[PDB]
């Protein structure tokens, strides 16, 4: 018959620090065994304090992105202020649940700053179940990224090691390392890596090369 | 998932693990499975996380509107009935939801099990989730209405713990809430690894 | 079913077999598959009998009202567009392969194909139906630009004879109709009037 | 559309210096039958954009009708505004996603090419609403056969002339005629420059069959 | 359907239809009620004692539920409507909420109903 | 899936003149854990171990029949078996059931009994061999293990570092898998000795 | 799984139901009540699907109470039974049918005691005695064996005990306790629970 | 997997990639897909890995027996026959897709062999998930009677096309050149893919892993 | 549905099983024995499919007895367990597989008390305590909560009682009586049946 | 696939396309579908490539042994009978449409059809394969008793050209082979050598 879904691949990562938030993704858009494009990032700047990563079915990613934009503008018109990160998270939850019986095939991770200036990460399921996290990976290579981050950022299973907070520098090199490993083992992850850094200064974008096979 | 709740002389004990899986993969170990609906209403999360969270949030909204309109706070029974009636209209559509609504009322400590299937029953002890069978084993062996508060806490914590031990889809941390006449208090949030060393040696 | 339409200078030529089957049984061995849509516009039907009859009636109705309201002889392309609209809008509920052909003072003799999908294309010649499959080659090797009316007549007659010989869902009698500014000339080839071809012996 | 009927195969597209070229054979296939061997699967959508379609031809005709009406409706105003290629691409994306979400899709895969404001545009739109931009595009078997060649060139020489692009396209169409059983040796090439949209008539691909005499050894 | 504004504002800011309704009430049988400690009593005046009439069929004191009773004054038919609607709502309250019904709640329902009829077309 | 019915994880890692092999200890039936001391690593001679994950029955059965054929080998010939040879033997054993396979994905780790050169490999359920110079994994948390091993493994590691690495990899990979864990065991083997340890692990 | 039983005497109706609310392999409640008061002299014993039982039963209940408040008198057990049967029959071919099996016990001042049996298909049948559930298959025969139309309520309770004991003996499901009520001229009376002190 | 084969003036060039995947996860970055059949005959394998392994090994063995008995060098037709008959007997249940190439007394010969047992003798062939890309390269840039380095370049180009355009393929490129009097088994003719250098040192120090139980066993 | 349980002490093995043979909705037997003597110090607790349990169990039994008669000495609980596991594993992919879950209790003069757990897939696992059936889901945790390796047989019986009482409380299935045996140095001893006088 | 065989006086003429597809992809655009069974006996293959190759090899083997044991040139009817036996006995496991044709000192030039069922019939001319469907009419209207060898050559060439033009599973190059007492004359028509037909324009 006819299937309204197709898996487009993509990996997505987000880390929350004391004064920063990282939202990274690969740039490969794939279908089946083919590459649609090597320049298609999964990161979207929403506000000056909030970025969202969307992985999964590309059509739903696009649609959801545009819906979020429109609704941000609407909240601004209606309240004369911009949406906080938490507000965007909650609104996203409702938007995702409105399609409870015909879901967006999208894994979302929001990264940004709260109103105290602290780093905030929100992770979602396709129907809008969402929680707050220190760090979260979603997408095809999620199961490869998550355990290392649990080790190097959460210090799990490590005996007599100091619990020093994550610095931006270390976080950046961590993101690069995990995406480099994922590009080795996941056939969906590769081509390039876009990193979005969120601080009080605004949003930085960095691009690192990954292997093209 | 393993959740339990029981009412005794001093209120309602509510406990839950914190693991969430997607197949065999562990998606999270930091899930708040005790839902703070109100300062006076607790829910639990079993089945679909989204369904429980969304519908009990809608419940919270309705309860607040109720408090504004009638200048009084909803009863546990009316809240559970509200939730059950809301969920019943989507019967057969695929909602997965097993929750326990806990509170304190004009009738005293209230505890209702509410299903996505349509069930809504009052009772003394309940346990919901893939680990419920294991939690029932210890909870039933230890339960008394005349338990002391510390005894109650230890019982709930141990039940959830043993459940984490046997059930592959349960683990992470044991969270524990206490519902008293003046509202609920967040009692504890111990990690399973700590509880292992506390209990075994 | 085997339907066919060839365009010439002064107009068009239509041909169809006369077999309508329900399974292997022939419910009608003498079907009229050339259906007048207007004074000089015909359609060749193929597929579900109910569907094609209903659609043809509807189009005849619409086109009649349209032509009265414009006070002009309707365009062949217009009838074809009406068929196209119906057959495309209800493509999942209709089983119809139509060939609209006729004459028109503005564009002359024309043939349009409206196959099962609901697309529409103008062609020099068109074939349709189960039997058409067997005469694609012949019709490709026999066609020639600038045929006379009688040549097109003999052409469709031959092609249809071949198809009817090979296809089990095709047979019976041959119905032909020439259309031009002159008018409509219908005829029927039966029995020995139907072209024969030397059958292999030894 | 639930069951596609008459269909067209691959559509090619590549950007070059100050323009875009698109290629597509003139065949409408009825299953395995090469039924309609002289149909255009390329539309001129105003003066700065053009479209090529794989998939169901009837749905392509529908889209052609709707788009045509949109262009006309816009040009009626004469307000010094016109749909950019990116805008047509956006609209088409929204349309395909909408039909997809109604479980009644338009069975098409489309390549939109355009030139406006000194920049080349090349967009891909799915029947599920999967859309993106790329310097080279190939639908269907072109995605397996033509696209590796196109990418091979464009990652060794990102900027092509119109001639290099046209040659590349001819070679790709040739390969498709070799390895795609639902293609036809009769195709169209459409080009957008600042001078507008040009659709070059029926072109044939030269073929080589020397390997026919390499049976024994 | 009938979509015409019946109740509208007058230049002096009055709702004339509502005032006329209140006049209609003013033409009604006198009804009084008093609240005690463990008792509450309501009494209605002129029962239109025709004596050829069954009193039971013309009582102006109804019960809405086991918990709540009510008297009225005005147009008896309108009263019948409002009363029965109040009864339905009294039961629906028990359905939607395990607890019965408070007097203020049903009073609020009836009041809101009347107000709704002061502001609806037709 | 059949492989996920009991779950479990097995990993092997190369070092300098040493090699390591590890496995979780859980035996469970779907969601329910039955035992926490299930053996998944079997000695097939001095300085040569095999790790079996998947369907517990076929773990035990493949192990047993393997020991059968191996003992016969070491009797007919007057020598302990070479690692490559053991790999080919297992491959043969598994491919004999090409159309009704055992549901196990074995991992072999050992030192050449003549030299000391470390050897690791893994096989299909139908015995397709794969040798690497870094690491091999098999189990329900394969993606996890890949993730850890790609980020922790260095080339020329000494016994202690090989230990720490394979231990952290196993622990952190297994701790993101519901049907693997309940303890971890590590055999680190070198020319002169064999160290066997059980790790401090989560039990949930 | 749920058990209902009704026995009609010359001037009384005896009813009993199991007190287990079960899900999966566990008993979640052991003091569950299957009965619903609908009038001063009418009981509705409802059993079946999870949400349908309570929804349907309570709907009927509030409608009967509504009738009482609107008209001053109560419905007869017959009028009630036909009312629930009409409601159940109208929803049968709708989008939202109710999977409920039910008994209706009642006492009328005129026609006397009544016991009605209702299938989930909404077939209404008056009977001297009836039962619902798997346990019925083991109990009905006993009733058939020992029921006489002039049975005293004492003998009725004894007979009931025989049935429940049989349930304890042959039925694989637990069912340790039973709600027992009786309806007569004076209304609904609660009798002591029939229980079997297992543990 | 992307494997290819071509016939040039002096013999045959075989090519393969080196990625082995389990599902959509790379298991092997350096898989050998070019198999020894006989000293003059080699075979690239795609499809079910174990089946290609065992099929190719079995045929190699039988061919060694054959040449040992005949005292002559095996012919490519022989390998083709053995393979295709064995495969046909199993009705496609043995998932071996093969590119068979060699040099005989009759010269160079290249067959493609499908798991159902059909074969094709062609100057250039491709098999695997990346076969269409490689075939595109061939159909664009192949000429008869090429020279050695030209043929090697063409084949490596086709394998590269597969590597970069197919998710099933990746890593290195292996070539095997077979002429009337030479055999160049270039393991990795090319490493167009590299892991990015580690930015960090995630090295764990001794004692960072908690231990419950230890047991040292001395050997000999 | 069937329940088995085994608890290993320092010098004894305690075993218990339900005594219900059930079919459909009725208990057909209430004194059914799930245990099989295989040696003087070995018990086999078998449970599962209708014919497979007895066929398999008795096959194993007669083969063990055969070993004893052929060699003069008995099999060890370990050798026995691996024997049944081998037989069960060989039939797994055959035309005639056996749907049996089993416990093997034993006492060896050398290695001491032993308790083995076997899945129907023939996975063999030695354990300090184990259980089979739906009831296990409600009992294992209790054991986990209260088991210590040095548990006395008296305390073992008490613990067993706790588990069975829990079964009486939460389990929907009846199960009123339980076979209880114990194995030590002196052989197999029958203990009084744990029962709950329902009716 | 489109295969064809025409019998003339001194012998036979064989023709086939060269397209072998797996789905819509062309695994071989230059297939040899004319397979020598003996010195003067050929077979045209259609259907599963594996099946037809295997069967052809088996028949070649059997017929070789047979002809050696009889010390005579084998009959065409014998090869045809061997194919018939295999194709009928394993009709549920084979997908093969075969045309056996050749010359024989006893019965001269002959053509036999062995379609998917496993039946066998001698014909003046035979066509087979997916493309054959499209040239039934042409071949029926073009055939004529007493064609010369070159006439049959041109005939099969034309028919195959038409089929290849229409059928997607057919195409590539044309392979012809004339068989007579003289011997076997194989040739290949490619590109412009392949007969063309005037395509409809306006």
From Swiss-Prot, chain A:
Keywords: Acetylation, Cytoplasm, Deafness, Glycoprotein, Host-virus interaction, Intellectual disability, Nucleus, Phosphoprotein, Proteasome. Signal peptide: none annotated. Gene3D superfamilies: Glutamine Phosphoribosylpyrophosphate, subunit 1, domain 1. The modification Phosphotyrosine is found at residue 122. The keyword Ion transport does not apply. GO terms for cellular component: cytoplasm; cytosol; extracellular exosome; extracellular region; ficolin-1-rich granule lumen; nucleoplasm; nucleus; proteasome complex. Disulfide bonds: none annotated. The modification N6-acetyllysine is found at residue 176. It is linked to Neurodevelopmental disorder with microcephaly, hypotonia, and absent language: An autosomal recessive disorder characterized by microcephaly, intellectual disability with absent speech, severe developmental delay, short stature, and hypotonia. Affected individuals also manifest aggressive behavior and have hearing loss. Belongs to the peptidase T1B family. The 26S proteasome consists of a 20S proteasome core and two 19S regulatory subunits. The 20S proteasome core is a barrel-shaped complex made of 28 subunits that are arranged in four stacked rings. The two outer rings are each formed by seven alpha subunits, and the two inner rings are formed by seven beta subunits. The proteolytic activity is exerted by three beta-subunits PSMB5, PSMB6 and PSMB7. Interacts with SERPINB2. Interacts with RFPL4A. (Microbial infection) Interacts with HIV-1 protein Tat. This is Proteasome subunit beta type-1. It comes from Homo sapiens.
Swiss-Prot record, chain E:
GO terms for cellular component: cytoplasm; cytosol; extracellular exosome; nucleoplasm; nucleus; proteasome complex; proteasome core complex; proteasome core complex, alpha-subunit complex. The keyword Metal-binding does not apply. The 26S proteasome consists of a 20S proteasome core and two 19S regulatory subunits. The 20S proteasome core is a barrel-shaped complex made of 28 subunits that are arranged in four stacked rings. The two outer rings are each formed by seven alpha subunits, and the two inner rings are formed by seven beta subunits. The proteolytic activity is exerted by three beta-subunits PSMB5, PSMB6 and PSMB7. PSMA7 interacts directly with the PSMG1-PSMG2 heterodimer which promotes 20S proteasome assembly. Interacts with HIF1A. Interacts with RAB7A. Interacts with PRKN. Interacts with ABL1 and ABL2. (Microbial infection) Interacts with HIV-1 TAT protein. It comes from Homo sapiens (Human). Its main location: cytoplasm. Belongs to the peptidase T1A family. One of its GO terms (biological process) is proteasome-mediated ubiquitin-dependent protein catabolic process. The chain holds residues 2 to 123 of 248 of the full protein. This is Proteasome subunit alpha type-7. The keyword Metal-binding does not apply. Keywords: Acetylation, Cytoplasm, Glycoprotein, Host-virus interaction, Nucleus, Phosphoprotein, Proteasome. One of its GO terms (molecular function) is identical protein binding. It comes from the Eukaryota. Induction: Down-regulated by the ribozyme Rz3'X. Up-regulated in colorectal cancer tissues. It is found in: Cytoplasm; Nucleus.
Swiss-Prot record, chains G, I:
CDD domains: proteasome_beta_type_2. Keywords: Acetylation, Cytoplasm, Host-virus interaction, Nucleus, Proteasome. PROSITE patterns: PROTEASOME_BETA_1, PROTEASOME_BETA_2. Induction: Up-regulated in ovarian cancer cell lines. The modification N-acetylmethionine is found at residue 1. Transmembrane segments: none annotated. The keyword Acetylation applies. It comes from the Eukaryota. SUPFAM superfamilies: N-terminal nucleophile aminohydrolases (Ntn hydrolases). Pfam families: Proteasome. One of its GO terms (cellular component) is proteasome core complex. GO terms for biological process: proteasome-mediated ubiquitin-dependent protein catabolic process. Non-catalytic component of the 20S core proteasome complex involved in the proteolytic degradation of most intracellular proteins. This complex plays numerous essential roles within the cell by associating with different regulatory particles. Associated with two 19S regulatory particles, forms the 26S proteasome and thus participates in the ATP-dependent degradation of ubiquitinated proteins. Belongs to the peptidase T1B family. The 26S proteasome consists of a 20S proteasome core and two 19S regulatory subunits. The 20S proteasome core is a barrel-shaped complex made of 28 subunits that are arranged in four stacked rings. The two outer rings are each formed by seven alpha subunits, and the two inner rings are formed by seven beta subunits. The proteolytic activity is exerted by three beta-subunits PSMB5, PSMB6 and PSMB7. (Microbial infection) Interacts with HIV-1 protein Tat.
Curated annotation (Swiss-Prot), chain H:
Its EC number is 3.4.25.1. Expressed at a low level in colonic mucosa. Up-regulated in colorectal cancer tissues. It is an enzyme of class 3 (hydrolase). One of its GO terms (biological process) is proteasome-mediated ubiquitin-dependent protein catabolic process. It is found in: Cytoplasm; Nucleus. GO terms for molecular function: endopeptidase activity; threonine-type endopeptidase activity. It catalyses: Cleavage of peptide bonds with very broad specificity. One of its GO terms (cellular component) is cytosol. Keywords: Cytoplasm, Host-virus interaction, Hydrolase, Nucleus, Protease, Proteasome, Threonine protease, Zymogen. The active site is at 1 (nucleophile). It comes from the Eukaryota. Disulfide bonds: none annotated. Belongs to the peptidase T1B family. The 26S proteasome consists of a 20S proteasome core and two 19S regulatory subunits. The 20S proteasome core is a barrel-shaped complex made of 28 subunits that are arranged in four stacked rings. The two outer rings are each formed by seven alpha subunits, and the two inner rings are formed by seven beta subunits. The proteolytic activity is exerted by three beta-subunits PSMB5, PSMB6 and PSMB7. (Microbial infection) Interacts with HIV-1 Tat protein. This is Proteasome subunit beta type-7. It comes from Homo sapiens. The chain holds residues 44 to 263 of 277 of the full protein.
